[PDB]
Short mmCIF file of C-alpha atoms and ligand atoms in Angstrom, two decimals:
data_model
loop_
_atom_site.label_atom_id
_atom_site.label_comp_id
_atom_site.label_asym_id
_atom_site.label_seq_id
_atom_site.Cartn_x
_atom_site.Cartn_y
_atom_site.Cartn_z
CA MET A 1 71.28 17.22 -16.20
CA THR A 2 71.34 20.94 -16.12
CA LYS A 3 69.53 22.80 -18.87
CA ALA A 4 68.87 26.25 -17.34
CA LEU A 5 71.18 28.58 -15.41
CA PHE A 6 69.74 31.41 -13.30
CA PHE A 7 72.09 34.21 -12.32
CA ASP A 8 71.62 37.04 -9.88
CA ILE A 9 73.41 40.18 -11.09
CA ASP A 10 74.86 42.19 -8.19
CA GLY A 11 77.51 40.29 -6.29
CA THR A 12 77.04 37.24 -8.55
CA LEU A 13 77.77 38.33 -12.13
CA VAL A 14 78.85 41.95 -11.39
CA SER A 15 81.30 42.65 -8.60
CA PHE A 16 80.36 45.31 -6.08
CA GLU A 17 84.10 46.08 -5.76
CA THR A 18 84.97 46.57 -9.35
CA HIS A 19 81.52 47.14 -10.82
CA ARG A 20 82.50 44.76 -13.63
CA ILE A 21 81.86 41.18 -14.67
CA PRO A 22 84.95 38.97 -14.21
CA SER A 23 86.52 37.94 -17.48
CA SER A 24 86.32 34.29 -16.50
CA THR A 25 82.53 34.66 -16.01
CA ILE A 26 82.13 35.94 -19.57
CA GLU A 27 84.25 33.06 -20.87
CA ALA A 28 82.25 30.52 -18.82
CA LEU A 29 78.92 31.83 -20.14
CA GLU A 30 80.29 31.79 -23.71
CA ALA A 31 81.22 28.14 -23.26
CA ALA A 32 77.88 27.24 -21.65
CA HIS A 33 75.93 29.00 -24.39
CA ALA A 34 77.68 26.94 -27.10
CA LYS A 35 76.87 23.75 -25.20
CA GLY A 36 73.21 24.73 -25.27
CA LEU A 37 72.64 25.87 -21.68
CA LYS A 38 69.90 28.44 -21.40
CA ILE A 39 71.18 31.47 -19.49
CA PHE A 40 68.74 33.58 -17.50
CA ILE A 41 69.06 36.71 -15.37
CA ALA A 42 67.24 36.63 -12.02
CA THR A 43 67.41 40.04 -10.40
CA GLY A 44 65.69 42.38 -8.01
CA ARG A 45 66.48 45.20 -10.41
CA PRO A 46 63.76 46.40 -12.75
CA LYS A 47 64.75 46.38 -16.43
CA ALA A 48 64.91 50.17 -16.32
CA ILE A 49 68.02 50.03 -14.13
CA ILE A 50 69.80 47.00 -15.61
CA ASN A 51 72.77 49.09 -16.79
CA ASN A 52 75.58 46.62 -15.99
CA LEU A 53 75.11 43.68 -18.35
CA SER A 54 76.24 45.08 -21.69
CA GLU A 55 79.11 42.66 -22.00
CA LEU A 56 76.67 39.74 -21.89
CA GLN A 57 73.95 41.48 -23.85
CA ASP A 58 76.20 42.57 -26.67
CA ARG A 59 77.44 38.95 -26.89
CA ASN A 60 73.83 37.77 -27.16
CA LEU A 61 74.31 35.32 -24.30
CA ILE A 62 71.09 35.90 -22.30
CA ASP A 63 67.98 33.87 -23.13
CA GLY A 64 65.48 35.53 -20.77
CA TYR A 65 64.95 37.74 -17.75
CA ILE A 66 63.42 37.47 -14.29
CA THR A 67 63.26 41.06 -13.03
CA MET A 68 61.73 42.73 -9.97
CA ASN A 69 62.29 39.53 -7.94
CA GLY A 70 59.99 37.52 -10.22
CA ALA A 71 57.25 40.13 -10.57
CA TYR A 72 58.21 40.89 -14.19
CA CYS A 73 59.51 38.14 -16.44
CA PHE A 74 60.17 38.20 -20.20
CA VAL A 75 61.81 36.22 -22.98
CA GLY A 76 62.94 38.36 -25.88
CA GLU A 77 60.18 40.94 -26.33
CA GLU A 78 57.50 38.66 -24.82
CA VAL A 79 56.27 39.26 -21.27
CA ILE A 80 55.57 35.81 -19.82
CA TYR A 81 54.43 36.84 -16.33
CA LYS A 82 53.88 40.05 -14.38
CA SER A 83 52.15 41.11 -11.16
CA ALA A 84 51.08 44.20 -9.28
CA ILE A 85 50.94 44.99 -5.59
CA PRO A 86 47.49 45.36 -3.89
CA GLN A 87 46.77 49.08 -3.90
CA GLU A 88 46.05 49.15 -0.17
CA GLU A 89 49.60 47.91 0.46
CA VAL A 90 51.11 50.41 -1.98
CA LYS A 91 49.28 53.19 -0.09
CA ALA A 92 50.30 51.88 3.30
CA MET A 93 53.98 51.71 2.32
CA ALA A 94 53.84 55.23 0.92
CA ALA A 95 52.23 56.50 4.15
CA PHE A 96 54.75 54.68 6.31
CA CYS A 97 57.77 56.03 4.42
CA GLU A 98 56.39 59.57 4.28
CA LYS A 99 55.76 59.57 8.06
CA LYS A 100 59.13 58.05 8.86
CA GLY A 101 61.07 60.36 6.60
CA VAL A 102 62.58 57.66 4.42
CA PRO A 103 62.72 57.43 0.61
CA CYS A 104 60.94 54.84 -1.49
CA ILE A 105 61.19 53.87 -5.14
CA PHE A 106 57.98 52.91 -6.94
CA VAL A 107 58.38 50.83 -10.10
CA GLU A 108 55.67 50.57 -12.78
CA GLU A 109 55.90 48.49 -15.96
CA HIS A 110 57.14 51.43 -18.00
CA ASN A 111 58.09 54.12 -15.42
CA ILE A 112 60.28 54.31 -12.34
CA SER A 113 60.01 57.03 -9.67
CA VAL A 114 61.46 57.94 -6.29
CA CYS A 115 59.75 59.77 -3.44
CA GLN A 116 61.73 62.09 -1.16
CA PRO A 117 65.14 60.85 -2.24
CA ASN A 118 67.97 61.53 0.19
CA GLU A 119 71.71 61.37 -0.07
CA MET A 120 71.67 57.58 0.50
CA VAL A 121 69.70 57.14 -2.64
CA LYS A 122 72.50 59.23 -4.30
CA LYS A 123 75.34 57.44 -2.54
CA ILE A 124 74.16 53.97 -3.36
CA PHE A 125 72.16 54.00 -6.57
CA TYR A 126 73.91 56.88 -8.42
CA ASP A 127 77.39 57.11 -7.11
CA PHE A 128 78.14 53.46 -6.23
CA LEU A 129 75.98 51.78 -8.87
CA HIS A 130 76.01 54.48 -11.55
CA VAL A 131 72.25 54.10 -11.96
CA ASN A 132 70.79 57.04 -13.88
CA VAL A 133 68.93 59.49 -11.64
CA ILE A 134 65.36 58.30 -11.06
CA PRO A 135 62.72 61.04 -11.44
CA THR A 136 61.15 62.37 -8.29
CA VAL A 137 57.39 62.26 -7.71
CA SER A 138 55.31 62.91 -4.60
CA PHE A 139 54.23 60.06 -2.33
CA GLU A 140 50.66 61.03 -3.13
CA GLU A 141 51.14 60.53 -6.84
CA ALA A 142 53.13 57.32 -6.40
CA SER A 143 50.53 55.86 -4.03
CA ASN A 144 47.98 55.87 -6.87
CA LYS A 145 50.02 54.09 -9.52
CA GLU A 146 49.85 50.44 -10.51
CA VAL A 147 53.05 49.36 -8.85
CA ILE A 148 54.98 46.16 -9.63
CA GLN A 149 57.77 46.69 -7.04
CA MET A 150 58.42 49.13 -4.22
CA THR A 151 61.91 49.68 -2.84
CA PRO A 152 61.83 51.42 0.55
CA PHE A 153 65.11 52.60 2.14
CA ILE A 154 64.23 51.03 5.53
CA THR A 155 66.18 49.25 8.21
CA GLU A 156 65.33 45.73 9.35
CA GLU A 157 63.74 47.36 12.47
CA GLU A 158 61.69 49.68 10.20
CA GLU A 159 60.75 46.63 8.10
CA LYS A 160 59.24 44.91 11.22
CA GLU A 161 57.42 48.12 11.93
CA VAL A 162 55.80 48.37 8.44
CA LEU A 163 55.16 44.62 8.00
CA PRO A 164 51.53 44.65 9.25
CA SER A 165 50.68 47.19 6.65
CA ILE A 166 52.05 45.04 3.76
CA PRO A 167 50.39 41.78 4.91
CA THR A 168 50.49 39.87 1.60
CA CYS A 169 53.68 41.13 0.01
CA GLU A 170 57.07 39.48 -0.27
CA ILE A 171 60.08 41.44 0.96
CA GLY A 172 63.72 40.72 0.40
CA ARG A 173 67.17 42.32 0.15
CA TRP A 174 70.14 42.21 -2.19
CA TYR A 175 71.85 45.13 -0.49
CA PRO A 176 71.58 46.04 3.22
CA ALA A 177 70.35 49.61 2.87
CA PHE A 178 66.95 48.94 1.21
CA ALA A 179 64.44 46.17 0.49
CA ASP A 180 62.32 45.19 -2.48
CA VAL A 181 58.59 44.57 -1.98
CA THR A 182 56.50 42.58 -4.46
CA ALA A 183 53.10 40.88 -4.48
CA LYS A 184 52.22 37.55 -2.86
CA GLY A 185 54.49 34.72 -4.00
CA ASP A 186 56.62 36.87 -6.29
CA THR A 187 60.19 35.84 -5.54
CA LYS A 188 62.92 34.58 -7.86
CA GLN A 189 61.51 31.05 -7.28
CA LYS A 190 58.33 32.17 -9.10
CA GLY A 191 60.52 33.55 -11.87
CA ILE A 192 62.25 30.20 -12.29
CA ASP A 193 58.88 28.46 -12.52
CA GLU A 194 57.68 30.89 -15.23
CA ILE A 195 60.85 30.65 -17.32
CA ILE A 196 61.04 26.84 -17.21
CA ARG A 197 57.30 26.60 -18.06
CA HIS A 198 58.02 28.64 -21.17
CA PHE A 199 60.96 26.46 -22.28
CA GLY A 200 59.63 23.01 -21.24
CA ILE A 201 62.50 22.61 -18.76
CA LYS A 202 61.96 20.63 -15.58
CA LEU A 203 62.84 21.95 -12.15
CA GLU A 204 65.25 19.02 -11.78
CA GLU A 205 67.27 20.54 -14.68
CA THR A 206 67.90 23.98 -13.09
CA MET A 207 70.87 25.63 -11.42
CA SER A 208 70.85 29.01 -9.63
CA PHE A 209 73.62 31.35 -8.51
CA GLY A 210 73.36 34.08 -5.90
CA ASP A 211 74.93 36.10 -3.13
CA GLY A 212 72.02 37.73 -1.28
CA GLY A 213 69.01 37.21 0.91
CA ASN A 214 66.69 37.70 -2.09
CA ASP A 215 68.38 34.66 -3.68
CA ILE A 216 67.62 32.21 -0.87
CA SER A 217 64.28 31.03 -2.29
CA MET A 218 65.82 30.34 -5.71
CA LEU A 219 68.94 28.69 -4.17
CA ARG A 220 66.58 26.29 -2.38
CA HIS A 221 64.19 25.86 -5.32
CA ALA A 222 66.60 25.14 -8.13
CA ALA A 223 67.92 21.58 -8.37
CA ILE A 224 71.41 22.91 -7.62
CA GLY A 225 71.86 26.22 -5.80
CA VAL A 226 75.31 27.88 -5.84
CA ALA A 227 76.20 30.58 -3.30
CA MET A 228 79.04 33.01 -3.95
CA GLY A 229 81.98 32.68 -1.62
CA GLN A 230 81.53 36.07 -0.03
CA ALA A 231 77.82 35.59 0.73
CA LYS A 232 76.57 35.69 4.32
CA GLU A 233 76.11 32.42 6.15
CA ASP A 234 72.38 32.11 5.72
CA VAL A 235 72.73 32.47 1.93
CA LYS A 236 75.45 29.82 1.95
CA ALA A 237 73.31 27.53 4.07
CA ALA A 238 70.45 27.76 1.52
CA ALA A 239 72.75 26.58 -1.29
CA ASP A 240 73.91 23.12 -2.20
CA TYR A 241 77.40 24.34 -3.10
CA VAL A 242 79.50 27.32 -2.06
CA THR A 243 81.89 28.55 -4.75
CA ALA A 244 84.84 30.91 -4.55
CA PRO A 245 84.34 34.63 -4.12
CA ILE A 246 83.14 36.51 -7.19
CA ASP A 247 86.54 38.04 -7.96
CA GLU A 248 88.32 34.66 -7.53
CA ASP A 249 86.55 33.11 -10.50
CA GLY A 250 83.61 31.87 -8.46
CA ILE A 251 81.15 31.47 -11.35
CA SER A 252 83.57 29.72 -13.68
CA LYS A 253 84.87 27.43 -10.94
CA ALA A 254 81.34 26.37 -10.02
CA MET A 255 80.38 25.71 -13.63
CA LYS A 256 83.53 23.62 -14.12
CA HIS A 257 82.89 21.73 -10.88
CA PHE A 258 79.51 20.55 -12.09
CA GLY A 259 80.67 19.84 -15.63
CA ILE A 260 78.45 22.57 -17.11
CA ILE A 261 81.61 23.54 -18.95
MG1 MG B 301 73.06 39.90 -5.44
#
């Protein structure tokens, strides 16, 4: 039976339409918590920009975090796993984005920076997602930092063009306009493995929930993968179960279906 729940944030817990968590999702997680489910976040966001979970956090419902697509995982105050991108690949992404004229975010353990931000950074991160403005730094300075995640604002065509210069990194998307890049093997699947190692939970006892391409590995990896009803077809196909759309009680309905609650 299920012991650990892994939730993506954007499009899974938090609606892109309303920018809020559905009330029935909060009630479902309350009920699961009391039954002893462990509740984990599994997000491409770095901690620095997780500004949309206060309802869950203030209710003390979250037992641990997988952030930066698995490249930075912690339980309470304790970091249980982290990684960094090979510096050659950091440099090559910075050079690519600078030449192409596209912005890129560079995330360190305790700092976050953006290089050559444009209005699409503003339109998506600040105005749509209400993320606090990220400080600007030069590509040169960013290219020398110890980087856990890079988030280039590149198309899928630009992604194919920079792929040979990030030969070992993972790349995935939770939103079409940008991608997240992390070191070899660092996907939300890695995050699940680290969290369940910490708690003595078996893979066979896990359930994941997601809406995006960066959820596919964890939808496949968990014993039961749940795709949100509005997810694209390839996300749905990676899941075991497709629930209702987020704003039609999709999380609660899935949890009830399985008898989690
Ligand atoms: Mg998502």
